[PDB]
Each structure stands twice: as structure tokens, then as C-alpha cells.
């Protein structure tokens, strides 16, 4: 299973970063959050998480995208940056 959710962050200046480390993976397609940067917009917002898959940013499809394409979109964005995320899997597993 997965959860699909939308997270809107707001840049306080046009050059503000989101505070997200984005990666590609060697065994599945997509752009993924590895982790968030301390004190960044994403961390302050709280919602985004390690292992989230970024499906789109500002309506721009990233399902089969790259970190580079995400970077291009974010750097050119206006103040509102909306990320559509897929969060796979269970939050707790007893094993």
C-alpha cells in the first residue's frame, strides 16, 4: 500500500531551498527523499519524510523523473512549491 498526499511549502525568497535531499534509486524508478536538512522549510513543515517518492511538483510530473529535473522545477518555482508524494508501506511492522 501507499499514502498519496500533497505538501505545500512556501519560499520566503526566490532563492530559498526546500531543505530536501533528493535521490534516484538503483532498483526502482522515481525521485525519492533521502532525508531532510536541519531547520529547512521541509523539516519545519514536518510532513515530508525519508523514502517518500515525489510524483509531481507544481503539477509537473516526476514519476519517471530525475533529481536534476526536480532541481530545475524547484529553482524556477514561484513562492509556493506543492509536492505530490507517495509514501509506501507500513509505518510499523512487528517481525
From Swiss-Prot:
Species the sequence originates in:
Homo sapiens (Human)
Q: Please indicate which superkingdom the organism of origin belongs to.
A: Eukaryota
Give the residues of the full protein shown: 336 to 424 of 690
| UniProt domain PDZ: residue ranges | 6-89
User: What is this protein called in UniProt?
Assistant: Ligand of Numb protein X 2
Q: Subunit structure of this entry?
A: Interacts with the phosphotyrosine interaction domain of NUMB.
Domain observations? The NPXY motif is required for the interaction with the PID domain of NUMB. It is however not sufficient.
